[model samples]
Target: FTINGLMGYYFENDFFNLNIISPTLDGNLTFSKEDINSILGNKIIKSARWIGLIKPSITGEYILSTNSPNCRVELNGEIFNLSLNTSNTVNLIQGNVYDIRIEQLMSENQLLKNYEGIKLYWETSDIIKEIIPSEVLLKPNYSNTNERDTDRDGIPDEWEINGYTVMNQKAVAWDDKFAANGYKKYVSNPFKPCTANDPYTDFEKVSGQIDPSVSMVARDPMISAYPIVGVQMERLVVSKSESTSHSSTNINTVGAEVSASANYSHTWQNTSTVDDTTSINTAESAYINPNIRYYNTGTAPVYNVTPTTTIVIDKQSVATIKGQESLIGDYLNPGGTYPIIGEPPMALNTMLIPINYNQLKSIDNGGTVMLSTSQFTGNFAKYNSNGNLVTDGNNWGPYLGTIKSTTASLTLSLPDQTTQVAVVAPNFSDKTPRLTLEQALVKAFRLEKKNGKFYFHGMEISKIQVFLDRNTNVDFENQLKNTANKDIMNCIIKRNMNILVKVI
Candidate 1:
């Protein structure tokens, strides 16, 4: 009967300035930097508060903590400070409701700092220090949170910038491209995300926690796992009716991909942007000198990473059919001839024990299954010839079980292999690079008469000049000797910018 996640009341400034009346509310307390910046269009947040009630399931002494820099926690009228390592402990009883309020603050100066989250965590003998799951937490007084709807527009005042709720007009297809009354023109499309016009109203925004003002850049996707049948087989023991066996592999992938269709509106901006007074002055100078700044009215794009499941199957059986299907049936029913593939018959004298019948290559390298499908081979075969897999219609398994010789009792084994597999991840970027060229001929070249003979220090300049002459339609020889050429000097400075450099 409890709702998971606390109530989040986000403010524009570092202090909860309710007088401003503009606030962002989040249902869950946890937040990421991507999300924090996402809400307000950019990183403008300085303070946030969350209110909720919690009921401990396994009651006892619990250590409560937080990761936020400046945070205050109040539990049932008791106060605790999360700054300066001031952690607090308190006894909680099972099935008892306690009032919990959390207020977090960050410095406006360090907006670049990570807003990973202002997460609430707890500890007890039954559980380690982990974020308190939303399951046992309930929002207090939910009904009154959205009681004020300005202009009766169905959107609560909290979610609107006056009567205007956050809206992505680009996503909406208007009925007539409009002559006023544009809101009435918005055409809602079916079965698609972001296709409908969002009113940024009470029911549209706060109730669903959707930012009525913005759109998703890389919309999050879903994961899928389709089964790849390992193998299918059947057999008949003269002593028994029928035997069935199977193995399966999973095909995992994403259901939807990142479709980065962001909304944008271009408008004239009186440049107060890049500035130039020194080595970096020109690009800034152009802006400062009164060039039109083309600013787009859209939120900065961010990535949407979807979580995925990693799948793994155990090792393969050692004594199953090494080749194609149809084994015991070949002998017991005479449905075409097929010898008992890899290992000998299981009927054996009191069931034997041996691991023989070698192979050309083993996928179970060092006793594990490798995910590399490159040097790819039969996880299903025991032997291979010059170009083909050895299938005398009987080499089926790497299966592990056996059959009793006389009783004709059949058995199957599970896969048991561990091999290296490849996965994915991202790397770091450290830019602003300077590239250089090293060549002897480009150093300098000259000829001087000495000791009755002509001596040269470097490659002749004329030869280099000729090469440039043939390759370049534009003159490079006299251009090098000139100074103060407007195009040349200005380009060099522009090249020396908040810039990367290169010598060609």
Candidate 2:
């Protein structure tokens, strides 16, 4: 062997030097208590005592767990008992505090002959703690001085009392207000907390349900709403199959054609901008979509800029046409009427006709025109291309007639055309179209409120039964109310729609 680098290089053969202790042991190997105590004097010792009481703060159920098998559990001044893994769970009540204690036992001789290094574990909901420097550790059983309420009110000792109900945590502090009638007129979940997008309560009762909240708090608020025929969508399914085989004489030809189509007569209500913008051209896939753009000045350019050019179809006419087409669905408005209040003698076929803007050609040039009684068909009428009246074979029930009144209204030829019509006492309010039919029907039974105030959005069906000659459950008088705020956000349109078709 050679030494590689250091002070110098060197080569070595074998060499050996050995020194060992005597087999007879050098000194005594016995341990004394005094010697052991002297060795442990420099080490810091931790007390095994608990700092404070371990108890259930708010009890529902409790399970206790201890790392070692030598632990015991006790509750509320109970005698010391050994804790085990198979302990029981105790139900806790509010306002009742609990005290629990856990004790660790020494593991000395509980294992079997073959089993060594075995340990036990306990499980419980008992709170645990280590010895700490605090007054709580000094007095574990001490209780608070103000444990009970001094006043007879239901509020607790440490509670702040507002002028409202004492038991309710939020009544006073949150400023929750009740209606004049001392009833719960408002209800909303967190998601639908009476906001602009959620109209769950800002509507009428008896004929209206609370406004809808965001999807989270949404329950079908229209459970009691009257039924309307919803349009039924018809679906068609087609299947095709092909098979081939070798033939002695070949004469093969292959040809096939497949097609699909759908038709729906739906009403386009002015309830929402989406509904108002819907057009027959788009529905039929025959027209180009109108473009929308934002101007830098925070305004959008109008499709028809000039005074003479109007782009959108007339709202009243569109509503009438859509109401006719959507006849297949539950067309019943809240109380018991249609949104399209037609002339007295307006016929069914006439009501079903689609509204066409082509008839307003006369208004394009800003020309003056007048509607007369003779040309009037009923409360509702159709306009031709020249803005003239177009009457078809549609007729009315015997008790029904038409009239033209006012300079702006056409002159109807009927003698009673100008007769003043009055509503009877306890006149039913009309059912306005809600965002959904379900909500509209909810108003017929229950009361509704918005922003802490009650609104007349729904009809009381029960009231209609008690006062009217013939029960008109769906009333629309409210829709025709003098308050005509066409804006959906600010307006409540509950116009009466009861068009009594005279018994033919």
Candidate 3:
């Protein structure tokens, strides 16, 4: 909730030569030369980088310029070279978060060098040119993003699967110094850290994803970036459950004068509301939580922060019924004998879950991080061609007692009559543990910008494929690229996930 400058990484040679971390840069984000050389003596600081997020109070077109010849900057994921006090024009938004990276690669000239001072300035229609302020930058808490750490090494177990300790989201944005030409020459590390904590100051490194001794030795960025892995989390409560069970008004045929009774079963899940604050260890948790602080700073309490909550769904058990057994109870029986009779519509119960948000995390998407189903326990009934309840109670799927995607429609199988149900779905809900993960990636894939193209944290989609149930289908790629398609969007949000987005 406070403004700190970007995390700075200083090197002896262009980068691998030598480097160290500074509390001034890491703690206060002091974008200056003295702070860079505060340690490691007064040797020429050859290379360095400042990595973190930036915010613009005003929304509009602006120009950013810096004096250092070695400075190359990345604002909002786009890289640009600004030397000799040059400037670049960019459009920014008010309160919209932007990941900012400023790197320095110092090269000597005739043995005389410009003082190692990296001064960046910006000006917009509504504001004057000034050095970026500290109040606008923030330091990220990687270990806190996720709560899983079996080894207690501070890195999440999921990230450890890929040998990635630091998120490229928080790590430096670097050029692939050794990547083959003509491809994605620049790469971001979603898994590992570019440089370890200060070798001189062990007190600085928070987590031990990689060795601190390695930074003492020159490690290649290309090697460290070859593999990658990488969210925020919100607490949830199950509010209530939704369900449906009804009997037919009348049999399809009254000629027989038989009164048919449909006996459908009902089931439910857990429901709850969402809290506004994050799981991060902030003062607000102790004070804002206890309802003690009449915290004053702004004009007043203009509004409240609350995450959205939602309710949750059901199906089948077992039944030994007669008829062309297949068509007797199974739904939308694709195709078969027995005069091609159709199954009755399956009815499901809907459960109500709630959410309250107060900026759980800035989504495309600031609020509404919830309203999904998880408490999956229910039963269903089946009808015959005559529309009589033949199978009193049956299971909708083999994977019962779990969340499922809404029934889109059905497909008929002519000769075999093995009707394809148009789907075989309703897996466990992802909303339970990694709610933020599925939600974030779904939104990340389609983050449309002012330019009309899509971007994921400033990286354009180079390739996309989805892995569900551990198998991938290229069909997702179609919806990933064709922004016009919406079925894939809701299809993902409603179902369980885990979207792999490739960027350049």
Candidate 4:
């Protein structure tokens, strides 16, 4: 149910006053700050009442629930006194739009002091159980403005081309040279008449290549057991089958970074009392030099007192986490622990035991077969220097009855003088370094200082440069001298810019 305009509110000084009219009414009875301010002044308003029109979809008994103060609901002039803190019901004529008036009052001033706001709910018993929808409610002779100024440019959006509130008459073209400066545009593309006009299309396609048929096999225990072949050969296998694809461009909005350093010093004076014991004669001699014994002729246990003064100075420093991203990380992880710097390397296996499926099946069916021990020779005599395989005159075979039903096992001994003929260095690679003097200087000089404040203007002009004079309203004004000069003092009002000067 849409409750259109003619929605009004009343504020009572003694009992209740129904003299004000609201520009709009929330069909769902959910009034906003603007509605509250328009109905009642910004000051404390009590004994307020809201009135509107509701058009029911079907004629039936509608249960109304309200979470407001003392309220009264009237359906087409029939009034029902509803409990201020409870729910009620009223018989509404279906399709017959009726005037619905709600009265809310705080009789006592003490209770009015604690009043928050008003919340209303309504629904039909047999059909729905929620706040009344805005569609079904209607106000007499009421019309809504489809010409909303979404950009808040003071011009109706529908009257302008494409929802872009035009500031100048000549700036009508979608791609006009001065469109950016001459119009207040919505978040979407301003030139396109419809927001959905632009369809996204991918500009890039990815492809990759893999080397043809690169593989390895280790039938003998010597090659698989050697550390060199175990580590390096595995990498070779991976490089052979590796497929890589990449896009040309990557877009990212990385978080900003900040850093700061502060130096401080503290100095203070400290005093200490010292007590000394000396022989009576020695004390007397010392007092005579100081003239202290003359004031106290009767020796006070022949004691001597002394006081010492010292000045201490201390230097202090504060180190701030640099950059926005790093500072955010510091805040997220106060424990100051982070994962290892780089990504984990790809997993590759150097040794692979060749399993013959047919032979294994046959062996499972009580058959015996020879498992030959083969060795890889370092001599690149065959297959384009890919190494040659030679069989060591050793074979092992076992009957199915001698082995476990579901498992097979084998044991082999290491060869004497089984030397690795190849070596691979994991760290040797050509990669660009991450740091430079230019980048360091950029980071050092590109620092951004953050501050917040309020400002007051003493003059009014259509186009003027606002200057923040002395005694500005910011707390750390001295620290923001540069910002005040650059951003505040030099602020200029353009034709497209809106400068709101709030008058107190």
lDDT of each: 0.29, 0.21, 0.31, 0.26
lDDT of 1 at 253: 16
The local distance difference test score of model 2 is: 0.21
After TM-score superposition, the amount by which residue 382's alpha carbon in candidate 1 deviates from its true location, in angstroms, is: 64
Q: After superposition, how far is residue 323 of candidate 4 from its true place, in Å?
A: 70
Which segments of model 2 are wrong by more than 4 Å? 1-214, 217-479, 486-504
Instruction: Compare the candidates by TM-score and give the number of the best one.
Output: 1
Summarize candidate 3's per-residue lDDT along 263-345 as a digit string, tens digits: 11112221222334223322221111100001111000101111111211111111111112223222211122111224222
Off by over 4 Å in 4: 1-6, 17-42, 84-88, 109-116, 140-504
Instruction: Tell me which of candidates 2 and 4 scores higher on TM-score.
Output: 4
Candidate 2 similarity to native, TM-score? 0.16
TM-score of 4: 0.25
> Local error of candidate 1 at 398, Å?
72
Residue lDDT tens for model 1, 188-246:
11211111111122222223332222222101100000001111112111111111111
**In order, what is each prediction's RMSD in angstroms?**
30.2, 33.5, 26.4, 36.2
Ranking the candidates on TM-score from highest down gives: 1, 3, 4, 2
Once model 3 is optimally superposed onto the true structure by TM-score, how far is the C-alpha of residue 372 displaced, in angstroms?
38
Runs in model 1 deviating more than 4 A are 1-3, 18-28, 36-42, 84-86, 113-116, 125-127, 145-161, 164-504
**Can you write out model 2's per-residue Cα lDDT over 1-504, one digit (the tens) per residue?**
010000100011111111100010101111123321211222111111111232223555544434343434455533332444445655544444344443433334233221111122222354532221121111122111133223322122222122121111012112333333233322211211111121122111111122111111122222111111112111111111111111111110111122011011112121112323322232221111111111100001111111111122333221121222212222222122222233122222221123233433322233211111111111111112111122221221111211000000000111211111111111122111232211222222233445433333432222221211111222223332533423223222122212111110
